[PDB]
């Protein structure tokens, strides 16, 4: 089993690891433009190794696509 699910850049991510968007992403739900900077801290590895779910201020628990997230901290 290699689910190794890494960052935008290529750091490794795992169940209580910490993203970042890299850049402005925007969901069609009542128009959510999520900035870039918006920290997702407390990601999960899921199915998907282009995948996690994590959470943010706002929205918790959401599966993303950790393509434009950033691993924060170091």
Do not use: H, Q, Y
């Not at 490794?12 to 900077?37: E, F, H, P």
């Amino acid at each position: 089993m290699s689910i190794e699910v890494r960052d935008c850049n290529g750091a490794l991510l795992a169940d209580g690891d910490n993203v970042s968007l890299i850049k402005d992403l925007k969901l069609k739900g009542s128009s959510t433009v999520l900035k870039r900077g918006t920290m997702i801290r407390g990601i999960r590895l899921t199915d998907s190794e282009d995948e996690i779910e994590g959470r943010t201020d706002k929205i918790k628990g959401l599966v993303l696509r950790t393509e434009f997230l950033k691993k924060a901290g170091s």
